[PDB]
């Protein structure tokens, strides 16, 4: 439930940090 | 003695062929410590081979499997080998290996870790 | 398969960079991706790997692979909520700071934390990451992360839950000390004192001549490795140069 919320929060933030480290 | 040195090259062509080949377990930094232990276990079987030579050969057998540098300056009955260019996981593997080999060889050695350099003082 | 691409790009990256750190992390990230059947985690690993092949800063390949290992340990099957919480704090904190030492420190601390299923340990690093998320004092942030990573190394070692209970107070003192403006030299000493107390061994720290000299006897072999990892990472993170000399299970450290 909230684990599904934090599931998205970790996956989205990870992909945002990847793009920030790429540029 | 003449057989102790032959075993070193068999393990040196094992450490180089393992660090070179892609694939396998890239966590076989323990395999390097295994080769260093196999060399000193063999050297202990020949109690006429120089202990200091056995530890130096194991430290060299280690730095080849890791891919780092090694310089040895000799003073009295002690040799000082300095290894440079180590990360934290390599500082631990090289330390654990020198700690194993000098223990299974029954010879006094002292280590000094600082950042990316690890200085070893192998004394007779 | 989605894991088949991860193995190909990971093995294709080890034949490129000649930093052993890139080799162990890219291989470790691929190995964790085979357990995780979550397609969203396999996408973050595949995106980080494909983006790390193109980049050639190497230190950026480190930080990119660190996110791949962290998001993979969280994607591990049946992951507790608190684990995912710890990771989000580290991922956010890494995005909210420009120092590459903070980005590495925050990611590595959460990676080592999720290794142990110790609930007292997961809360110590979680509350620590929250505090660093608020303050902007870089030295305070680095000290909080250096203490969280060292505490995680004790938990991964598997010390007594009572020993970790004592170590928690040393982390609380460490974070408080950096709050009161402690020097970078003394903060590292607090990291060392958490290791000796968390492993059930004794110490004998000396001090004379603007150079603290902590000698520690009784440490076994495996304990000297866990000490060496935490003290070295904290020394590089805080930015101080230390010397860890070994001689018959009597570790001696020289800070300055």
Residue numbers in the entry:
A (entry chain C): 2 to 24
B (entry chain B): 1 to 124
C (entry chain A): 1 to 256
What did the published study say regarding this structure?
Several natural systems exhibit ‘facilitated dissociation’, in which an effector (E) can bind to a target–host (TH) complex to form an excited ternary complex (THE)20–26 from which the target dissociates quickly. We use a switchable target binder (host) and a flexible effector that can rapidly bind to and switch the target–host complex to induce a large steric clash with the target, forming a strained excited ternary complex. We show here that by explicitly considering excited intermediate states when designing coupled protein systems, a broad range of facilitated dissociation systems can be designed.
We next sought to determine how the target–host–effector ternary complex deforms to resolve the designed clash. At the concentrations of the components used in the above experiments, the AS1 ternary complex is an only transiently populated excited state, but at high concentrations it becomes the dominant state (Kd,T:HE = 200 nM). Double electron–electron resonance (DEER) spectroscopy and molecular dynamics (MD) simulations suggest that the ternary complex is dynamic, with varying amounts of strain at each location. In the full facilitated dissociation process, as the concentration of added effector increases, the rate constant of facilitated target dissociation approaches koff,T:HE, strongly suggesting that the ternary complex is an intermediate in the facilitated dissociation process (lower pathways).
